[PDB]
Amino acid sequence: AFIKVQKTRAYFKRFQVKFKRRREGKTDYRARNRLINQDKNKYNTPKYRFVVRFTNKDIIAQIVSASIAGDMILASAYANELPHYGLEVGLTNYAAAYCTGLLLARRVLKKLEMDEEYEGNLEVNGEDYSVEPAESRRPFRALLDVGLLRTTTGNRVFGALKGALDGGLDIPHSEKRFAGFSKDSKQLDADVHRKYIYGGHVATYMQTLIEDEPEKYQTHFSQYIKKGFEADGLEEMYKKVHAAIRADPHKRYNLKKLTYEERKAKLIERLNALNSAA
Amino acid sequence: NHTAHNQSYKAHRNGIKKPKSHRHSSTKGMDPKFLRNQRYARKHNK
Amino acid sequence: LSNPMRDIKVQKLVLNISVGESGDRLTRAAKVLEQLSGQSPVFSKARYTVRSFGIRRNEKIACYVTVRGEKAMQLLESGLKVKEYELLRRNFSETGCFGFGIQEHTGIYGMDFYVVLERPGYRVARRRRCKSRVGIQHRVTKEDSMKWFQVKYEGVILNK
Amino acid sequence: GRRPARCYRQIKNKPYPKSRFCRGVPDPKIRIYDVGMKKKGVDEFPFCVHLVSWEKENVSSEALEAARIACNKYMTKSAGKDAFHLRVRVHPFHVLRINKGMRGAFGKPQGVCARVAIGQVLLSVRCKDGNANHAQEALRRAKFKFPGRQKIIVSRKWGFTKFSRTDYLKYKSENRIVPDGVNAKLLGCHGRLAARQPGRAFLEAAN
Amino acid sequence: QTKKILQLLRLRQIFNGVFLKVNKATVNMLHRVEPYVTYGYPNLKSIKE
Amino acid sequence: PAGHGLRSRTRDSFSRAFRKKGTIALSTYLRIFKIGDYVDIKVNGAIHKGMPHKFYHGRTGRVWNVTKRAVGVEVNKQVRNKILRKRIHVRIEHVQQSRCTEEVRERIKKNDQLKADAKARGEVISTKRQPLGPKPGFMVEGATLETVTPIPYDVVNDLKGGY
RNA sequence: UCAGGAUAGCUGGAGCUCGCGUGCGAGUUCUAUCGGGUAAAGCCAAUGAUUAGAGGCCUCGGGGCCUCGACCUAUUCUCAAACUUUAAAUAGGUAGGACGGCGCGGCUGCUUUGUUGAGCCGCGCCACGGAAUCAAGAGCUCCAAGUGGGCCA
RNA sequence: CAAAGGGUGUUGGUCGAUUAAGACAGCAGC
RNA sequence: AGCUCAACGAGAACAGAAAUCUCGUGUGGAACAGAAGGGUAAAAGCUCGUUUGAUUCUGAUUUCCAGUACGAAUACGAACC
RNA sequence: GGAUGCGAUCAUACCAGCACUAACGCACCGGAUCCCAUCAGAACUCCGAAGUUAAGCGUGCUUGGGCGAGAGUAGUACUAGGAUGGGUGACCCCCUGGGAAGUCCUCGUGUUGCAUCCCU
Ligand SMILES: [K+]
Ligand SMILES: [K+]
Ligand SMILES: [K+]
Ligand SMILES: [K+]
Ligand SMILES: [K+]
Ligand SMILES: [K+]
Ligand SMILES: [K+]
Ligand SMILES: [K+]
Ligand SMILES: [Mg+2]
Ligand SMILES: [Mg+2]
Ligand SMILES: [Mg+2]
Ligand SMILES: [Mg+2]
Ligand SMILES: [Mg+2]
Ligand SMILES: [Mg+2]
Ligand SMILES: [Mg+2]
Ligand SMILES: [Mg+2]
Ligand SMILES: [Mg+2]
Ligand SMILES: [Mg+2]
Ligand SMILES: [Mg+2]
Ligand SMILES: [Mg+2]
Ligand SMILES: [Mg+2]
Ligand SMILES: [Mg+2]
Ligand SMILES: [Mg+2]
Ligand SMILES: [Mg+2]
Ligand SMILES: [Mg+2]
Ligand SMILES: [Mg+2]
Secondary structure (H helix, E strand, C coil): CCCCCCCCHHHHHCCCCCCHHHHCCCCCHHHHHHHHCCCHHHCCCCCCEEEEEECCCCEEEEEEECCCCCCEEEEEEEHHHHHHCCCCCCCCCHHHHHHHHHHHHHHHHHHCCCCCCCCCCCCCCCCCCCCCCCCCCCCCECEEECCCCCCCCCCHHHHHHHHHHHCCCECCCCHHHCCCECCCCCCECHHHHHHHHCCHHHHHHHHHHHHHCHHHHHHHCHHHHHCCCCCCCHHHHHHHHHHHHHHCCCCCCCCCCCCHHHHHHHHHHHHHHHHHCC | CCCCCCHHHHHHHHCCECCCCCCCCCCCCCCHHHHHHHHHHHHCCC | CCCHHHCCEEEEEEEEECCCCCCHHHHHHHHHHHHHHCCCCEEEECCCCECCCCECCCCEEEEEEEECCHHHHHHHHHHHHHHCCEEEHHHECCCCEEEEEECCCCCCCCEEEEEEEECCCHHHHCCCCCCCCCCCCCCCCHHHHHHHHHHHCCCEEECC | CCCCHHHHCCCCCCCCCCCCCCCCCCCCCCCCCEEECCCCCCCCCCEEEEEEECCCEEEEHHHHHHHHHHHHHHHHHHCCCCCEEEEECCCCCEEEEECCCCCCCCCEEEEEEEEECCCCEEEEEEECHHHHHHHHHHHHHHHCCCCCCEEEEECCECCCCCCEHHHHHHHHHCCCEEEECCEEEECCCCCCHHHCCCCCCCCCCCC | CHHHHHHHCCCCCCCCCCCCCCCHHHHHHHHCCHHHCCCCCCCHHHHHC | CCCCCCCCCCCCCCCCCCCCCCCCCHHHCCCCCCCCCEEEECCCCCCCCCCCCHHHCCCEEEEEEECCCEEEEEEEEEECCEEEEEEEEEEHHHEEECCCCHHHHHHHHHHHHHHHHHHHCCCCCCCCCCCCCCCCCCCCCCCCCCCCCCCCCCHHHCCCCCC
């Protein structure tokens, strides 16, 4: 039978729209509120967020502070600009996330004129690292803002966290989510964690396909092959990229709103046509 | 049982009395962490 | 309209066996799905106690399993083959879905076959971030599902 | 039995309608508010006359039914069973209490009444121009059934519609009137254009 | 309220009189003691006498 | 206590505004509060912690302390023949920065420069504001005069839209 | 505990500290700004109550293809101390300088990536009194009486 | 203290009808 | 941490008004121990993980109010989680 | 002129239908060795770059609903103060002041911060 209209006038009159970022599915305001809310007895003390976002083909890293007018960007780093340093492929894997985090850490310290005091971790062995405080200056402190992704063990976001930590930034964290951590043993395996930092897992998969499915290897890694990158050569590439990062870190096509006169004129034409009908 | 009749008249005989306001107010009830540091700051003031 | 991204495909196949009571029968019924589908089924519990049906609340009375991929196609043709590749015109829902039921298939249990058809791009309504709605023109309609069944299995639709 | 109406004539308490707080309320004496040919079209009865209240008082449901019956009978005889439409414009929603010493004197519900204001219409009758005299006379008899002072006012509107008789003909001649039984709908220049009919689409509002 | 306003106008006794400058502040005060006073625009003769 | 709970008679005062429920905008948490600032107390019904008693709702006070999540506020309260300086702590969700003194700071600077400019020229002046005074005389150009007269009475018009 | 008492308020006495119009006080207004859910209003907005027809009449029941009622759409009469989108008048809070402002220095164990903040301190400079009206003045303390049946508009 | 409701008591007012082409009353044969 | 409820619409052997399963709409019309009111939707609701801040030490403030106590609540400080 | 990341304001930003988009993007999308994840690689997670702008995102349109603003409703309803005012009463006029809200009507359909990139 006829069904009562669910979305009547009354439904829209009492409807309250959520925040634009919420209904666009991009901001978790419960998390955002607890990230930016500063103690009132600290007054105008910025609370910086280490924002890491992953797209289908790029990694975005930013140091952000909140303000009434909006968020202010202190420093930013994109994985798409890593080719300037040497990394040409796999710009969204665990190793690329580590490079992006490292680049941001060196850039922000460069802007703050404190990169000389904090050189970060010099022996990347996969162990948990935290830059020790200097003599006359504490390390820059930031908070990780993971966004709407799932914080699973081995997630790329924690790969970028390790890069930022190795770059000399103080970021509160624990080792329970770095790649190589074991749920049962409750310990961090440095060898496995170091393997992911240099793309060892990517190299292992490349070798597995070659021995078993050479046809699949050609397609699954076409860009790697197109640029002469081998599985055994990935570790040396990333180590070179890390050293490079530390060395130096209008025509309109959319329609325009019709004016009142134009809209009225078209309305008259439709009105007359309807009247002339029948 | 109850009534407020005449009570406003009684209050205004000598009121309404506002409390005496001094330049310096008591620090009791303020953040002890802030107060303790302020005491040290005055101690070494020169 | 002929874009490759508009091709219809079977999103998943769901086999539901509502035995209507716990005990040995439910355990045996679950084993049928596990061997027929190759994966562990789920045990559904009654939402409300009903004395007429003899089911108590929070009691396992049914079991179902979801199958995707080639095995869904392999296990779907078998069901249609038993059905003689004929379905009633009312078996197709307005949201581009259809289903049927077999009563022959431990013992003998009647199964419930339901098929969900979706075009590529339905992830927009399933992903956690930037969750949205599939465009109306891109959704699979009742007519589209019928044509897919009439070309995928050259079946017949009986209005009756 | 029931107290004389003078006991609850004056509006002294806040509205006390039937609800989950006031239970055991007897039903109103009046249950029918429309009498006569209530299915007649809007274009059948142009004339309209009202019995307007001129006091702020309570009107019992018993009096409302008595006025309706008295008005209905005379109009039926004088004009006919299918020559008028009588509508009672007042509904009794206020509950009256009765305390059957003064300890715990909050009374039980006795009956219902209507809280009428000054200038509020009590009864309305629409018919043809030829039966205007009968309609006014029928309302005169109903006046004796009410406690206060009322007044007979001949409406300048077309029947029970909200349009003046001059405006109703003006709009109807322009084809802007869509009959809706006893009501009349005025067509504007809003809404989906396809919803309108060839001869019922306009560029400007009816002014 | 009236008692306070009349005190501010220095009208503490019946038939006492005073001058008052015209401005929104004073006019609004005077509006609140209207039934207790009568006033107007004095001419030069009245002010002299 | 003694016949009334803490939130008695707060059905309307503590309820959220129509179509303004749910998430609290984060500009509330970005406000900076200093000692001596004036704030208006407006209870937010969603935040149940650090909320002031219903009396302080709709009152303006002066900030006398700042904590991690709350500000100490001084509010005048009349008890019989005395005014009491009530000191309460309130979470910042229930306080709005008041604009009662917004004109003071800007007014002082204007007064200071006006006196400074007048001092150099040896002309004593006054920077005090004054209420609206009487208007001066002026001429109004003649125009067409519309005559207004009382309207004859009509009973049919004694109702919104007429009878 | 209910014909009582104590307690606070109202009252007297005793003063004391100052002040003389430059008052920092006011049962008043002005200016700026903040809170409200009563009156009215609303149902053609949620919740609840409630009258009538009109169209569609797909689908459900009712009876005899017909047919009444359920249903759907657009309208319509009349309502609410314990309903409400909206929303007064009156009344309520705060502010209108010398306890102001600026400049240069200093202190800290608190705070910051950071002499970054926060508060405080020292010195120098500026500050025609920073709306109206009134101000038989303002503040502070001590001891204590009576009263704690009210009534009228 | 006084009500609903009434008066061809009397005084004002409002709307309509009739009338020197002859109304109204009476008289006369419409 | 993930999830979204009541209700309705359209579909599926036994299966129907009402068992389970699928899609769609769904501002909360559900739920949140109890009275009512208020409040809450990537939650304060539902399902899981880990747990004992239902801990130790004072003082301050609010409500009651004589600006006494008790009960209850709130904001900090110093510890341990 | 726009997109993207983070945002501010939280409908002029929402809902419905229809139409449209250069480049870089953002997406859909391929795969399931490894981390992770479930009945289910759908989701989540990891790796990838063959295909497509079909959807999403973006923009425009609708005598669309809603929302926002104005006009009007109306000096109406109500209301502070005043009268040895009217009236049997109910209630109401006048005096000194303040002053709303549906329907109807017209118009509008976001604005904007930081950073990166395309148009170049
Ligand atoms: K009468
Ligand atoms: K009570
Ligand atoms: K209203
Ligand atoms: K209603
Ligand atoms: K006593
Ligand atoms: K008379
Ligand atoms: K949660
Ligand atoms: K659903
Ligand atoms: Mg979270
Ligand atoms: Mg009473
Ligand atoms: Mg007690
Ligand atoms: Mg009390
Ligand atoms: Mg005695
Ligand atoms: Mg005493
Ligand atoms: Mg106000
Ligand atoms: Mg109230
Ligand atoms: Mg109310
Ligand atoms: Mg009312
Ligand atoms: Mg006695
Ligand atoms: Mg007594
Ligand atoms: Mg009489
Ligand atoms: Mg409750
Ligand atoms: Mg507690
Ligand atoms: Mg996949
Ligand atoms: Mg497209
Ligand atoms: Mg519109």
